[PDB]
Design an enzyme around this catalytic site. Structure first.
Site, PDB file in Angstrom:
ATOM      1  CG  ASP A  34      -2.164   0.696   1.287  1.00 55.73           C
ATOM      2  OD1 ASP A  34      -3.073   0.244   1.966  1.00 55.73           O
ATOM      3  OD2 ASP A  34      -2.280   1.755   0.699  1.00 55.73           O
ATOM      4  CG  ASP A 217      -4.228   3.820  -2.345  1.00 58.16           C
ATOM      5  OD1 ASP A 217      -5.380   3.707  -1.934  1.00 58.16           O
ATOM      6  OD2 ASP A 217      -3.272   3.349  -1.749  1.00 58.16           O
TER       7      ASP A 217
END
Ligand SMILES: CCCCNC(=O)[C@H](C)C[C@H](O)[C@@H](N)C[C@H](CNC(=O)c1ccccc1OCCCOC)C(C)C
Ligand SMILES: CCCCNC(=O)[C@H](C)C[C@H](O)[C@@H](N)C[C@H](CNC(=O)c1ccccc1OCCCOC)C(C)C
EC number: 3.4.23.15
Lengths: 331, 333
Positions: A34, A217
Site C-alpha cells: 500500500d 494508491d
C-alpha cells in the site's frame, strides 16, 4: 545491490497481494502493498473468533518466532475502508530476498466488512513516515536504512487478468514497460499525491481543470473520485448506475470515450478497454466500470485516487529519493 | 574449466518445458525435455513404425543423413513412470546449447501413443547420474564434464510462470537474474539419483504428513508435485478436492482460499500458497479448476518417492550441484 522482486497475485483485478514472511522461522501471510498508508500489520494468534475476519485469515503466532520482541501499544489504524485496532510488536520480515527487523501491528480487533472481503491477510505500507500512525518507521525507510538495494525507488507492475504482477524494491524491472519514464512531483512530502490539471473525456476536459489532487494508491482497486465528480463523469460516459455501481451494456463498451488524466505535462489516457470490465460484447448484458466514487477524508482527502485501473496500463515507479513518481506504458 | 552455455526453453502451459538439441551432421533438431529423473537421451527414429501414430506426429532421426552417425544397435527399453519406450543404440554428435558431445543415444522405435501422442516434446535428455541410465549409456552431462569445458560442474533449471522466455537451463553455473536471496543446499541421500530427504509436508498449519520423513526426488521433467496415492489422498482429503480420474479438482471459486502447502526440505520450509498450486482458469461456482499436485507411485527402483516437479521449480530456482553431490534452492524471479 539489490533488486528484491516480490511477485504478486492478481485476484479478479480488484486486489493484488504478494507475500512476506515474518519471524524465525518465517510465518508467510499474503499482503497487499500500500502506497496510501505506512504501517505494516498482520492478524494475531489472539484475534477474537467472533471476527469471522480473524478466523478466516492467517494469524501470526507471536510465540513461534524465536526473534519476536513484543512491544504493546494499542495501535488504531483508521483506513478509508475500515478501521483495525491491534497492538504493536517486533520481528524479522523477509521481503523478497531482503530481511528487515520491523515493528509491525498485530491486529486484534478486525471489522469483518471489509477485511473478510480481503482475499489477503495484512498490508505493508510503502507510504511515508509522516503517515505512519504512531511514527513507527516504515519498511521502505527501514530497508533503505540498511543500504542494500541499489536506488530508493520501488515500482509496481500490475497485470491484467499469467504473471500476476510484481514489486521491485531497488529499481524498475524493465521487461514490463516501454519507453522511458516521465516523472510527476509530489505536492508535499508525506503523501504519494500529485496534481491533476484535468480529467478529459474523449475530447473535452470535463472536470478538474484548475487542477485537483491525485493520490497514487497501489492499495486501491479502481480510479476514484468524489461522489459528484464521478457523477458528472458517469453522466458523460452514458454509463448508468445499476444498484450499487455503474454499468454500461456490454455490446456498447467499444463505443465509450477515453478518459485522459493530465498529469504534469503529459497525458495518461485510458480507453474503454482499460476501464470497462468486459465480460463479452453481449447486446443482452450489463458490463461494470472500473472507476468508482470514494470519499477520502481530509487529512489526505478529499482526492481522486489512482489505483489498479491506472497501474495496469502504466507501470508506476516511486522515486523516494526525489519525491516524485514515474510512469511508463506497461507491458 | 570455463564456459557456461544456457539452453533456452519453451513453456507450454506450465506443463511442458522443452528446449532443443541438434543430433547429427547435418543437425536434425529435436525438441526434448531436460529430465533430472532419468539419464538416457533418446529421440524417435526413422525406423519407428508409423502404425505407432506418435511416430507419425513427431520428428524422427533419419540416421542415414548424419555423416557422423556410428552404428551400435543394442536394444534397450526405457520404462518411465508414465509409459515405456523401446528402441536401439546409436552414437552421433549432439549439441546441447553451443557445447558439442559425441553421445550414445537411443533411437526409439516403439512409441505408445498414450501418453506420447499428448507430448509437445520429441525426446528426453536425461540429466541424472549413471546409476540410473539404462544400459550404462554414459549420460550427457558426464560427457560435457569430461570435455573439461564448464566453469563449474553444476546445471541450473529456471522454470517460469508461463507467458516471454519459457525457462532457461544454464550449464556450468546458475544465472543470478532468476533467483534472489541466498542458495539453500540439501545434500543427496545417495549418489546415483537427485533425491533428497524430506520431513513433513504441512497443509496450512500442522504437519499433516510425511511426519518422521519421506523422500523427494527433484525431477525437472515432470509437471506436477507427485506423491504416493496412499499419501496424496490424505492431503487431498484435507484440501477437500475431488478425484476426476487423472488429476484432482476443486470447485473453482474456492481456490484462492486453500491453505498454503509447505515442504520441509532439509532445514527450511518451502511454501506454496494457493496460486502456486491451483490452475485458476475460473472463479465460478461451476467449473472445476485443477490442483497442480496429484498422486502417482514411482516404483521402488527409486524408492516410492514424492517427486517435486515444475510446480516447485517455478517458484524456486534449482541448482543441481553435481560437484558436491547436493541440490540448492533459492527464490525465483
Ligand atoms: C494510516 C491510515 C491510512 C491513511 N491512508 C488511507 O486510508 C488511504 C486513503 C488509503 C489506504 O491506504 C487504503 N489503500 C487501504 C487499503 C484498503 N483495503 C481494503 O479496504 C480492502 C478490503 C477488502 C478488499 C479490498 C480492499 O482493497 C484492496 C486494494 C488493493 O489491491 C490493489 C488497505 C487496508 C489494504
Ligand atoms: C532412466 C530411466 C528411469 C525412469 N525413471 C523415471 O521414470 C523417473 C522417476 C521419472 C521420469 O523422469 C519422468 N519424469 C519422465 C518424463 C515424464 N514425461 C511424461 O510422462 C510426459 C508425457 C507427455 C507429456 C508430458 C510429460 O511430461 C513432461 C514434463 C516436463 O516438463 C517439465 C519423460 C517421459 C519426458
Amino acid at each position: 545491490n539489490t533488486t528484491s522482486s516480490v511477485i504478486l497475485t492478481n485476484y479478479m483485478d480488484t486486489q493484488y497481494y504478494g507475500e512476506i514472511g515474518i519471524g524465525t522461522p518465517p510465518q508467510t501471510f499474503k499482503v497487499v502493498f500500500d502506497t496510501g498508508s505506512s504501517n505494516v500489520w498482520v492478524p494475531s494468534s489472539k484475534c477474537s473468533r467472533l471476527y469471522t475476519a480473524c478466523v478466516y485469515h492467517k494469524l501470526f503466532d507471536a510465540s513461534d518466532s524465536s526473534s519476536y520482541k513484543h512491544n504493546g501499544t494499542e495501535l488504531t489504524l483508521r483506513y478509508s475502508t475500515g478501521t483495525v485496532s491491534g497492538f504493536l510488536s517486533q520481528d524479522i520480515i523477509t521481503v523478497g530476498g531482503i530481511t528487515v527487523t520491523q515493528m509491525f501491528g498485530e491486529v486484534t480487533e478486525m471489522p469483518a466488512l471489509p477485511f473478510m472481503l480481503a482475499e489477503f491477510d495484512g498490508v505493508v505500507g510503502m507510504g511515508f513516515i509522516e503517515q505512519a500512525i504512531g511514527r513507527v518507521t516504515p519498511i521502505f525507510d527501514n530497508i533503505i536504512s540498511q543500504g542494500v538495494l541499489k536506488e530508493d525507488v520501488f515500482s509496481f507492475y500490475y497485470n491484467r487478468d499469467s504473471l500476476g504482477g510484481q514489486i521491485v524494491l531497488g529499481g524498475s524491472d524493465p521487461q514490463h514497460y516501454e519507453g522511458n519514464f516521465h516523472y510527476i512531483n509530489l505536492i508535499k512530502t508525506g503523501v504519494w499525491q500529485i496534481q491533476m490539471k484535468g480529467v478529459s473525456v474523449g475530447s473535452s476536459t470535463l472536470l478538474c481543470e484548475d487542477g485537483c489532487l491525485a493520490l497514487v494508491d497501489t492499495g486501491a482497486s479502481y480510479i476514484s473520485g468524489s461522489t459528484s465528480s464521478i457523477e458528472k463523469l458517469m453522466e458523460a460516459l452514458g454509463a448508468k448506475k445499476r444498484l450499487f455501481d455503474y454499468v454500461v451494456k456490454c455490446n456498447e463498451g467499444p463505443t465509450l470515450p477515453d478518459i485522459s488524466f493530465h498529469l504534469g505535462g503529459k497525458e495518461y489516457t485510458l480507453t474503454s478497454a482499460d476501464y470497462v470490465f468486459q465480460e463479452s460484447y453481449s447486446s443482452k448484458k450489463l458490463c461494470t466500470l472500473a472507476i468508482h466514487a470514494m470519499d477520502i477524508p481530509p487529512p489526505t482527502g478529499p482526492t481522486w485516487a489512482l489505483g489498479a485501473t491506472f497501474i495496469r496500463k502504466f507501470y508506476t515507479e516511486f522515486d523516494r529519493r526525489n519525491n516524485r513518481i514515474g510512469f511508463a506504458l506497461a507491458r
